[PDB]
Amino acid sequence: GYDLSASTFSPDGRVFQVEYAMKAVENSSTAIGIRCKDGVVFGVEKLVLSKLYEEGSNKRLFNVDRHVGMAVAGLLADARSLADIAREEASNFRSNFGYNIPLKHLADRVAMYVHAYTLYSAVRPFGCSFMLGSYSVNDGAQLYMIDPSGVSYGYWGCAIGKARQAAKTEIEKLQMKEMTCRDIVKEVAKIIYIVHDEVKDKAFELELSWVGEITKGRHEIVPKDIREEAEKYAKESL
Template identity: 35%
Template sequence: MAFVPPQAGYDRAITVFSPDGRLFQVNYAREAVKRGATAVGVKCNEGVVLAVEKRITSRLIEPESYEKIFQIDDHIAAASSGIIADARVLVNRARLEAQIHRLTYGEPAPLAVIVKKICDLKQMHTQYGGVRPFGAALLMAGVNEKPELYETDPSGAYFAWKAVAIGSGRNTAMAIFEEKYKDDMSLEEAIKLAIFALAKTMEKPSAENIEVAIITVKDKKFRKLSREEIEKYLNEVMKEVEEEEVKEKEEDYSELDSHY
């Protein structure tokens, strides 16, 4: 008889808690997000920025066809990490909810309402048999009265952030945000910070494998940056990255010298 690990019974069923209060399938869904491409969001007084790493695995893939930032409504966008097919289902649901709200009430949907609807759906997929949790997290950004930025978790939990990252580079990006984020930064500075944090998590950042979108307070319209715009910001950011790396090496050498 094959050995069965003690947690196996709780592992297979989405609706059964383990003795220590965990739902293993939800934890595994979070692992799918942790292994996914990095996505970051930065909020400032002038608007909100989303930036995502595009993992293009072949030079034959058309970069424009590999979409990781999605328009939900004129004033709302979402960036995904994890299983992209799962993310598309959530994005389509968010678009539907945004249009239902617009037709019902004659006004753009508040971002918080759409986030709650999506997280209600995610939570349902942790509670009923015959389904599995969504293996995707979304960063949802928008401007109603003011800029807003939310992270949604596979469990159905959601949080509002000033700056946040999801995916494999989360820890690196969050450390950068903790150090460099300022409440009074401009939109230009927010774009640079988002690209800087993303570039630090990537081996070879380029305008082809980075996607950036903004929504401004001024016009409340979603807009993706062109490749030329991303390249301009990336060139400026890479100079900062190189300067920081040189500074870190100099500090390491000075520490070594102090030991002799």
Template identity: 50%
Template sequence: MAPQPSEGAKTAAASSSANSASSAAPDSPTRTLCGGLRDQHLLCLHYREDQRHGKIPLGCARRWLTLEQTSIGTGYDLSNSVFSPDGRNFQVEYAVKAVENGGTCIGIRTKYGVVLACEKIITSKLLKPGTNKRIATVDRNAGIVTSGLLPDGRHLTNRARDEASSWRNVYKAPIPISALASRVGGYVQAYTLYSSVRPFGVTAILGGWDSEADSGVDGQVGSGPKTGAGGKVDAAAVNKGGPGLYMIEPSGLYWGYYGAATGKGRQSAKAELEKLELQDPNCSLTLEEAVKEAARIIHIAHEDSKDKEFELEMTWISGLDGPTKGRHQPVPQDLLEEAEKAAKSK
């Protein structure tokens, strides 16, 4: 008669069988899908043999799948040119997150011009005041403010300047704000198509004034045509210009706005901009009033980061009969101080 196993052996065998079944269960979050574990992640260890190079790792959608089976990335965020099964581009979404952690930037468009304002967070008391500006001039009739990664913003600003310069060389006139937004938006979108690049970690707000004056042709032999860029357009059909405000997102998407906001305090800023009813044709907000409103809105949006010091940076642009004569310029210091004082008192 064969010897019967002891009670201890039965218990051990049952425990071993249960553990084996548990590890093989399809719903167990700790099962090894692709290979080994590292830092609480399942790491893909698939490879192929190569006579010259030995073992070569293979890519896998499960490479950085967490033990909790979360839906964050799951391997589809490793390349900028790959969509997830539900149609998401995670690299672009991560770039948007970088913008959401940046300082608040806003743009206000009125019938008299455009105001750009930015909350520049002071990260160290040793920083020289007035440096690392977030607002820049693109052309004499256009300005740009960026929120997010400062180096990315500088590169995008330089690209916008190149586009404005190219337009001026060809058409002998300042670039329209809509055309500038289209070109910069296309450039940003190109950085979402290839695995060798990453999206821009900035959202840009473009503001400017399309000139009301007829554009003559400069620098050509002879008198040249008298009206329009190249003289191809009848004087009556020339767009007499006006203010323009556009916001370009990390995906390359851009829209025209009456009031735009981005950055950490964008929700509070948008709520305040909506109260101004800038889209109303009867809105009579002057540029000076828009400067004061912009300062007030930036201070309200700063409540989310009130433990940090910040500098208020602001520029404006008006029509040919306004205070800036159609040029993008910093807001005068006395008006800026008055606006800040009024904003702090509210």
């Protein structure tokens, strides 16, 4: 057994425990992030597993700082822990240096924290993936994605979850570079409706959040009325 611990390399140079944690992310629902000219829009296909649950239960969109949003996929409990780690990192940076933590630096810190759970037998790798979106006058729009192994990259468009491949194809058709947040929100809604499965995983709720010039650098949930148009437009599209 070469795949029982994170501190054991297999004969062909692989850490099977880290790869098993990635399977958990692939079982989760899709979440996409799109970076445009004015900011970043987040969209999650939140599956409603029961009618007894209230609307807004088990949200997958977090606020880790005033200007930073986080979209997650995988084990919700693992993801909530990572969100707390990120919040503390942002708060710590403000205390030590006196200003808003740059997104890239925040993504680096969290990724290394994630990377620390992939070296020992004493702990197990995190079972989730997440995206970090942000916007500031100085830095502009930023979007990063971190997976269970701890690798983090910057993206123009990203997707995580079960239909990550199908969502990626949809994202490549758009020209987000010259687009603005307002028109991108509808597109994000559209893509999630297209990749959503009907036969399996019946009934889902669309979660939307954004950060950019339109929200004055503050990450927040997309206003209900703006999400209405997007939901309407996405329904007609497909």
